[PDB]
Design a binder for this molecule. Structure first.
Ligand SMILES: CCB1C=CC=CN1
Ligand SMILES: [Cl-]
Ligand SMILES: [Cl-]
Length: 161
């Protein structure tokens, strides 16, 4: 298990445009296309992302290419964020994957707002952090996924996957 296999479990793989848990047009392994309600707008973002006229369908190779880019972008975003980077650097590699998972799902804006959880994580108060992380819209709207990510923060193991 690693961050790629973790997010592949949490996000699935779909090769046609679909709506994510929030109703937003998405493709591949959780590649958000747009928050616009226009499917045509989503298809335009897809063509721009892939570099060809797709009409809403991509290959698994293409999905994995966007996925690798999106994981990389999530990490690089964490490392540019003054709130997230010190907490991320304080973590072991397994909990680092949990941090990337949250940023992948929620965006660095939003995760940087988890101020009290971030402090508990930096302090390695794992059970306290896990309790605070669940007091969130994130947990309430995607509880099974949030429980897996939280268990990874709580234990530093891959037991939930
Ligand atoms: C709140 C989880 B987290 C997300 C990025 C960096 C550190 N921690
Ligand atoms: Cl791209
Ligand atoms: Cl869920």
């Amino acid at each position: 298990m690693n961050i790629f296999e973790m997010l592949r479990i949490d996000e699935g793989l779909r090769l046609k445009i679909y709506k994510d848990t929030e109703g937003y047009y998405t493709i591949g392994i959780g590649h958000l296309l747009t928050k616009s309600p226009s499917l045509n707008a989503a298809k335009s973002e897809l063509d721009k992302a892939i570099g060809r006229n797709t009409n809403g369908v991509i290959t698994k190779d293409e999905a994995e290419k966007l996925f690798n880019q999106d994981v990389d972008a999530a990490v690089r975003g964490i490392l540019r964020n003054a709130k997230l980077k010190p907490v991320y650097d304080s973590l072991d590699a397994v909990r680092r994957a949990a941090a990337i998972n949250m940023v992948f799902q929620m965006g660095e804006t939003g995760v940087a707002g988890f101020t009290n959880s971030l402090r508990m994580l930096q302090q390695k108060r794992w059970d306290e952090a896990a309790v605070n992380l669940a007091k969130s819209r994130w947990y309430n709207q995607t509880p099974n996924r949030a429980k897996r990510v939280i268990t990874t923060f709580r234990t530093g193991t891959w037991d939930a996957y």
